[PDB]
Amino acid sequence: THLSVDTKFKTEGLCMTYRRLISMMGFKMNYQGYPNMFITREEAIRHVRAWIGFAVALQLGFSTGVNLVAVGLPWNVVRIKIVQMLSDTLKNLSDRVVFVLWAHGFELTSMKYFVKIGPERTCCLCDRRATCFSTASDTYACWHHSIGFDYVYNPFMIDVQQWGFTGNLQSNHDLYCQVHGNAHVASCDAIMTRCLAVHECFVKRVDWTIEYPIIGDELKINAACRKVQHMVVKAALLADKFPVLHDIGNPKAIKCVPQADVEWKFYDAQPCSDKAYKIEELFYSYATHSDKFTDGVCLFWNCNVDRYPANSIVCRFDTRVLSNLNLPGCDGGSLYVNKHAFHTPAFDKSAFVNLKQLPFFYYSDSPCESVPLKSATCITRCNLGGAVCRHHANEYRLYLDAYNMMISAGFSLWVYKQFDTYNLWNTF
Numbered sequence: 266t267h268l269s270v271d272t273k274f275k276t277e278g279l280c281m282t283y284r285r286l287i288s289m290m291g292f293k294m295n296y297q298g299y300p301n302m303f304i305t306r307e308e309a310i311r312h313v314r315a316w317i318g319f320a321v322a323l324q325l326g327f328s329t330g331v332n333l334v335a336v337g338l339p340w341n342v343v344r345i346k347i348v349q350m351l352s353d354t355l356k357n358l359s360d361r362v363v364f365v366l367w368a369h370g371f372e373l374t375s376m377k378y379f380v381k382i383g384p385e386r387t388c389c390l391c392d393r394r395a396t397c398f399s400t401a402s403d404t405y406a407c408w409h410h411s412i413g414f415d416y417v418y419n420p421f422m423i424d425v426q427q428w429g430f431t432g433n434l435q436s437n438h439d440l441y442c443q444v445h446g447n448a449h450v451a452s453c454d455a456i457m458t459r460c461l462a463v464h465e466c467f468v469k470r471v472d473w474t475i476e477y478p479i480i481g482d483e484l485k486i487n488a489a490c491r492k493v494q495h496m497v498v499k500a501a502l503l504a505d506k507f508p509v510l511h512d513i514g515n516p517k518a519i520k521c522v523p524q525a526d527v528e529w530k531f532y533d534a535q536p537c538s539d540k541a542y543k544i545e546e547l548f549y550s551y552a553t554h555s556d557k558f559t560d561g562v563c564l565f566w567n568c569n570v571d572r573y574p575a576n577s578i579v580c581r582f583d584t585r586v587l588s589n590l591n592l593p594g595c596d597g598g599s600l601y602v603n604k605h606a607f608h609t610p611a612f613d614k615s616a617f618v619n620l621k622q623l624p625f626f627y628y629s630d631s632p633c634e635s636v637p638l639k640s641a642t643c644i645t646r647c648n649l650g651g652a653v654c655r656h657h658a659n660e661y662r663l664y665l666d667a668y669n670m671m672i673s674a675g676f677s678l679w680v681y682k683q684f685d686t687y688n689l690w691n692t693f
């Protein structure tokens with residue numbers, strides 16, 4: 266859970282323990298839920314929504330792209346702007362801030378000017394943990410109630426250099442990322458340090474053991490995506506009668522259509538060990554697998570490979586979508602934190618070159634029963650006749666709502682070019 270202040274601090278990167286470092290930074294530690302400003306990698310990963318890259322050269326820079334110069338601007342104005350920026354950035358994401366550092370010593374020295382530490386406190390106006398302090402009123406605020414507050418209260422931090430790196434920030438960042446160019450500017454170092462931290466913590470694999478709290482429409486977004494997944498995969502199996510389905514990026518061996526008359530094969534780069542017996546370990550790349558999975562259809566449900574083969578059903582998240590769920594990531598990618606943290610490579614149109622956009626439709630083979638619905642996209646027995654039944658018209662509108670929710674949440678659907686609803690009409 267917590268990082269003992271007695272833990273040694275590697276000074277090779279600075280331009281010794283955490284206890285001694287807190288003294289050097291100019292914080293009276295007191296005699297006695299805040300044993301250390303610095304936190305473990307594991308704790309930082311749990312609070313990824315709180316991550317703000319921070320660097321100095323004083324020119325103070327943040328991973329938000331903001332740079333502030335202190336004498337220039339006076340410190341009283343600067344510290345107001347910092348609390349403003351952090352409050353606006355984090356109020357809907359986290360109960361805290363985690364400064365992500367590539368520590369040269371100067372940034373740590375500068376914290377005494379805009380940071381106050383002490384025991385954990387609650388907001389003067391709500392039940393939330395205090396993130397801000399007002400010298401003027403001697404009161405404490407959360408990110409929501411910090412209007413006019415001048416000090417950051419009990420911020421957490423990590424030095425990424427303590428995760429064991431040779432060379433400078435730029436040499437390590439540029440190994441994994443070509444999107445953040447290093448100018449001689451503080452905010453560029455702030456961005457690169459957080460980018461590097463995201464690479465080290467999230468790019469390699471999903472950690473299924475770490476959950477993140479609900480902060481928006483996760484439940485409705487996820488319900489809508491699963492409803493659409495069932496509809497689309499059910500419809501493609503009925504329409505083209507594929508004998509095998511290659512579910513690439515399924516680490517739990519759960520079928521979205523369990524009643525489907527098909528051989529369902531599971532693959533993942535990182536299968537869950539309790540289901541590894543049903544799942545082949547496989548890293549899909551088009552260059553290494555373009556002549557494989559030639560039989561039946563491949564399902565890539567948010568399995569974000571470099572290029573999809575022609576025989577694919579695909580859901581892919583657009584990393585450019587602005588959302589409290591969608592955090593800046595590594596190499597033009599984003600970190601999508603919805604229940605778990607999913608690093609997603611940049612949305613790239615060249616991935617879909619073998620596919621077409623999946624058009625909207627509703628299909629039901631279920632029994633009929635009872636503002637009339639006149640739509641070419643309602644594929645039911647009753648629409649084949651004159652009027653659509655009250656059941657299927659209601660289910661159509663619920664399905665359209667789920668589809669619209671999924672699109673507005675940033676997900677797009679792609680399908681093999683031969684896919685057509687002609688063959689679903691045939692099933693009647």
Ligand SMILES: Cc1cc(S(=O)(=O)c2cc(C(=O)NCc3c(F)ccc4cnn(C5CC5)c34)n(C)c2C)cc2c[nH]nc12
Pocket residue numbers: 487490515516517518519566567568569582601603604605607608609
């Ligand atoms: C941007 C983006 C989105 C998604 S996602 O939208 O598919 C997604 C997936 C999950 C998730 O928990 N899957 C577990 C799981 C599986 F592994 C396999 C099958 C099922 C069936 N049901 N379930 C769920 C437990 C009920 C399954 N969650 C919470 C989200 C939001 C995955 C990404 C990878 N990179 N980027 C990604």
Ligand SMILES: Nc1ncnc2c1ncn2[C@@H]1O[C@H](CSCC[C@H](N)C(=O)O)[C@@H](O)[C@H]1O
Pocket residue numbers: 470471513514515516532533534535547548549550565566567568569570607
């Ligand atoms: N190139 C690749 N080849 C194979 N699996 C990959 C992959 N890139 C990512 N994955 C896997 O894709 C999954 C994405 S998250 C789970 C998605 C799953 N299809 C669902 O419906 O929930 C992870 O399990 C990850 O290990």
Ligand SMILES: [Cl-]
Pocket residue numbers: 468469470471534535
């Ligand atoms: Cl992976």
Ligand SMILES: [Cl-]
Pocket residue numbers: 584585586587591592593594599
């Ligand atoms: Cl983003």
Ligand SMILES: [Zn+2]
Pocket residue numbers: 388389390391392393406407408409410
């Ligand atoms: Zn409050």
Ligand SMILES: [Zn+2]
Pocket residue numbers: 438442443444445456457460461595596
């Ligand atoms: Zn980067």
Ligand SMILES: [Zn+2]
Pocket residue numbers: 632633634645646647648653654655656657
């Ligand atoms: Zn009907």
